[PDB]
Amino acid sequence: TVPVKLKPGMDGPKVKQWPLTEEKIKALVEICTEMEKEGKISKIGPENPYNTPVFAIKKKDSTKWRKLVDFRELNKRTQDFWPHPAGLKKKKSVTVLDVGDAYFSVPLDEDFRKYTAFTIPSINNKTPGIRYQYNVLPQGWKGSPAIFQSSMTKILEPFRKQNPDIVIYQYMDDLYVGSDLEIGQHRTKIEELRQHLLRWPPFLWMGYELHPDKWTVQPIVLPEKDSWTVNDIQKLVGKLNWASQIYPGIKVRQLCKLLRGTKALTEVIPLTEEAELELAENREILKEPVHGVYYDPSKDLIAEIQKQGQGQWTYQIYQEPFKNLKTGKYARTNDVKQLTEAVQKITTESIVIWGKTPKFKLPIQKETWETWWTEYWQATWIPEWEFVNTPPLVKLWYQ
Amino acid sequence: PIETVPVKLKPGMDGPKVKQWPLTEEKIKALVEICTEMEKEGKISKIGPENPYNTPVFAIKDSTKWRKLVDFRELNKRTQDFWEVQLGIPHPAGLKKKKSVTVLDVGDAYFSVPLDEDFRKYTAFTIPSINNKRYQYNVLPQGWKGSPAIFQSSMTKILEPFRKQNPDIVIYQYMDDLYVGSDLEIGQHRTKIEELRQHLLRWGLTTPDKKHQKEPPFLWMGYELHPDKWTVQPIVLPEKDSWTVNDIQKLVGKLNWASQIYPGIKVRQLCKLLRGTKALTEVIPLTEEAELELAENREILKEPVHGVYYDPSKDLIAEIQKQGQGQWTYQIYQEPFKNLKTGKYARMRGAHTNDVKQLTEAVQKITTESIVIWGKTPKFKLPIQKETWETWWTEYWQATWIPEWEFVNTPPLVKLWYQLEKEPIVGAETFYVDAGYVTNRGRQKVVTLTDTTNQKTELQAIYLALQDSGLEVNIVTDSQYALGIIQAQPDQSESELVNQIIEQLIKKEKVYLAWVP
Numbered sequence A: 001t002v003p004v005k006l007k008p009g010m011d012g013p014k015v016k017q018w019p020l021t022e023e024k025i026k027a028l029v030e031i032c033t034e035m036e037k038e039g040k041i042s043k044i045g046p047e048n049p050y051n052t053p054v055f056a057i058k059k060k061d062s063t064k065w066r067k068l069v070d071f072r073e074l075n076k077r078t079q080d081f082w083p084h085p086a087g088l089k090k091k092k093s094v095t096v097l098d099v100g101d102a103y104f105s106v107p108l109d110e111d112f113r114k115y116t117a118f119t120i121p122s123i124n125n126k127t128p129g130i131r132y133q134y135n136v137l138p139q140g141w142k143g144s145p146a147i148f149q150s151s152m153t154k155i156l157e158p159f160r161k162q163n164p165d166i167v168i169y170q171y172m173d174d175l176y177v178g179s180d181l182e183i184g185q186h187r188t189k190i191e192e193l194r195q196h197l198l199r200w201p202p203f204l205w206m207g208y209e210l211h212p213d214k215w216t217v218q219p220i221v222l223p224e225k226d227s228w229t230v231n232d233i234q235k236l237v238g239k240l241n242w243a244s245q246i247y248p249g250i251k252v253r254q255l256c257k258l259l260r261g262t263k264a265l266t267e268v269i270p271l272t273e274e275a276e277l278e279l280a281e282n283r284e285i286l287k288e289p290v291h292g293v294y295y296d297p298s299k300d301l302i303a304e305i306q307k308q309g310q311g312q313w314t315y316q317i318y319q320e321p322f323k324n325l326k327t328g329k330y331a332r333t334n335d336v337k338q339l340t341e342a343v344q345k346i347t348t349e350s351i352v353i354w355g356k357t358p359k360f361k362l363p364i365q366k367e368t369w370e371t372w373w374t375e376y377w378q379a380t381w382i383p384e385w386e387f388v389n390t391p392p393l394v395k396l397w398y399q
Numbered sequence B: 001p002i003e004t005v006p007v008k009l010k011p012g013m014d015g016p017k018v019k020q021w022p023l024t025e026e027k028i029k030a031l032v033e034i035c036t037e038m039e040k041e042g043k044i045s046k047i048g049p050e051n052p053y054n055t056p057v058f059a060i061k062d063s064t065k066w067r068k069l070v071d072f073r074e075l076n077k078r079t080q081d082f083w084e085v086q087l088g089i090p091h092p093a094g095l096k097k098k099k100s101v102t103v104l105d106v107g108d109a110y111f112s113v114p115l116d117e118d119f120r121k122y123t124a125f126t127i128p129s130i131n132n133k134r135y136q137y138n139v140l141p142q143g144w145k146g147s148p149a150i151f152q153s154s155m156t157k158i159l160e161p162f163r164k165q166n167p168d169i170v171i172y173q174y175m176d177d178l179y180v181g182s183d184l185e186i187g188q189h190r191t192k193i194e195e196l197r198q199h200l201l202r203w204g205l206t207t208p209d210k211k212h213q214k215e216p217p218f219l220w221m222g223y224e225l226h227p228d229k230w231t232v233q234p235i236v237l238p239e240k241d242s243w244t245v246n247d248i249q250k251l252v253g254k255l256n257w258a259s260q261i262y263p264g265i266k267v268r269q270l271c272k273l274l275r276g277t278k279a280l281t282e283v284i285p286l287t288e289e290a291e292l293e294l295a296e297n298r299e300i301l302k303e304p305v306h307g308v309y310y311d312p313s314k315d316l317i318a319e320i321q322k323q324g325q326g327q328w329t330y331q332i333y334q335e336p337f338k339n340l341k342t343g344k345y346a347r348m349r350g351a352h353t354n355d356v357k358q359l360t361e362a363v364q365k366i367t368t369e370s371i372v373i374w375g376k377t378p379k380f381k382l383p384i385q386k387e388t389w390e391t392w393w394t395e396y397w398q399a400t401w402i403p404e405w406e407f408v409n410t411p412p413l414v415k416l417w418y419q420l421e422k423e424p425i426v427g428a429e430t431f432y433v434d435a436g437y438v439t440n441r442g443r444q445k446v447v448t449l450t451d452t453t454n455q456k457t458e459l460q461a462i463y464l465a466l467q468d469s470g471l472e473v474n475i476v477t478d479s480q481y482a483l484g485i486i487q488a489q490p491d492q493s494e495s496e497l498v499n500q501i502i503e504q505l506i507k508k509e510k511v512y513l514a515w516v517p
């Protein structure tokens, strides 16, 4: 076993376990009991004061429960280890695979075990709770894929040469398999991969392929109206003015003249010649993303989501305010289910594109998210997230 | 017998070296008797002067003899943290009913459990000799940081077995007590209780005999528990004409506790008495409404009400009612009107809100509470109609989700009092506000304000506009703040200004509000 260690000075996570439903608890008890019998994990004494929250989640189209451990805190404190194929995104179709189970064949550093302590909670506190710690590389821990890389490299050696036409990327417990073959000749190459891996892995995301060339970006778009009322224009100026921040070439001087004096909101205004040309020019400037926005690896990726209504959502991934790296839409469930699907989708994208998860800003009350997010979550990683209250104006300027 | 838990001192630190303070000869005598005794029972052991560690001891006096009290403050400060013992207690509504119930006191618990051999050296203490010219512990010492944790951890393994051969019996450990409940018939039950005691005994653990045990019903954390029902212990509402801030606070306190079962308890009036109070001992005269409240609480409190237990076979049903502005009451039952537990939610999240948000939030609070006690969410009965909810839902920017729920026609029904137009109104006057306004129809007003705040000035504008405008009115504002607040369609606020606006808003037939930079 490799002697993993925490970042200098840091101690182990002592993270509070969010309460669970009798339903998830049961699953987690069945699962863990099985993991115990196979020595994957072990019961622990009161001399271990660490703790990582655990959750049970449903495997999409599988009927079986999955144990999802939230090692976000541990990971942040796990020493760094000392690459991303910009080609993967270029591929036409990519299938994600859950190679998490590989880890179970590698013992974990004996002195690091205690930090992976986690707890299966109980109803109404009728009993202290089952406490356990990992003996092997645990799924979801930043350390596993690293300590297993070498072995994972060797095991991918053949397929890698037998099919240098498909790119294979690994991120945590997931394998990202990209290709340009045909959806039929592709699913076959993925399967051969599966059979291969079985030699020494469920599909994730519907078993389905993402299709990563179409990841479209999204412009700011101005209304296209027949007649323009004072209101319309006002709103138009407002939006433009905002976008004025990013794209400096935007002008409103000519539109604003149509709004001189205090007219009635519904009064239809004919746009002068000057104005009409200013609009169209503004329109041209908006058809493409502001130039000069580059991804900086040394900076965090932030994803911010807004609720639009009717099952429609908008998001923006950036590193510096206004400097957007990507923007999109997501449409239908129920508010939460959707937001969790959107999150999982935007994450996957970030992973495929920049090889890392973004920090989310979610428009929802913490207590509510904590309550149902695990009901629809299916990914094996867990992004970091904070909770917010989006302004009526920001949303009023997207989609 | 029972396995040892590895203990260690915090990183970098070393055992305690605290000099033993002066002990009278009479005490010095009392200890040597006590300790010499504990050396015979294996609990402690004389050591060689190689051990530079020491923790001060002192004797305390309900007979003529004394008892040894070891001060472990230092050791504790130097000893590693442990997995903290359970902080929370099971709420009765989360228990099932039971035929027999017994509580077993576990004497000298910590005294029967081994202490990590490598750690004992640190528990060294000294007993001064009176002659003018040292031990360590071999078990869990009283007053040591890690004893409540290791003791529990032990008893659990100790119980694990007897727990598997008796899946029908239910055991709950709380400190040094062992509450056991079952559905065996009286005889069999007491007999099992007897086996338990042996099992606990085989590990030197000793308990009280049937005659000296505690049996239902019994208090416990301010509750009054029976094998078939539960409630709260007798709450006495003082009778007097001179109340101090303290009394009022304590009462309010007692009143709150009671509402987890007594529905209808009210404290609004009592609690207004505390406004601007200058001293805990200040006497506040009871106003008429406070007196009316007190008396009403007295009534409710005179004839007790119990809660029934949880029957996992049936569903959990939750019903909520609006008992005043910002006040909600709820009850969770399984059999119609046979309460497991009730409660009231008064929490306001944010300075402004409407009944739809509050309700929803109370729902979330209730859902959370239920998952913790029963491990499932109840099916809700809400005084709100599907459409009303849905209408506010989509129009709100935040996301939320209410589990299974069904409209219950039980006034008052929650509704939205007004809805901002989705588009400007034709023929409705247009007001441009900035403290004053200007309309398209030429009218205008400007007022001066003393004692204000930029953003309050903003709401003021809008206010004026609403006042002087007709039944329909368009309003254009520069304030994104004012926009924000009104957009959220609040029906209740901390501020009176927002509250006046809301009133105005309710009277209109159509209001359109826009923002411009």
Ligand SMILES: CCOc1ccnc(CCNC(=S)Nc2ccc(C)cn2)c1F
Binding pocket: B090, B094, B095, B096, B097, B098, B101, B170, B171, B172, B179, B180, B181, B216, B218, B219, B220, B225, B226, B227, B228
């Ligand atoms: C004083 C309450 O004691 C207990 C607290 C927590 N758990 C238990 C064991 C399980 N008991 C159950 S599920 N039911 C139950 C019913 C009535 C009474 C008076 C005590 N316990 C207890 F007996």
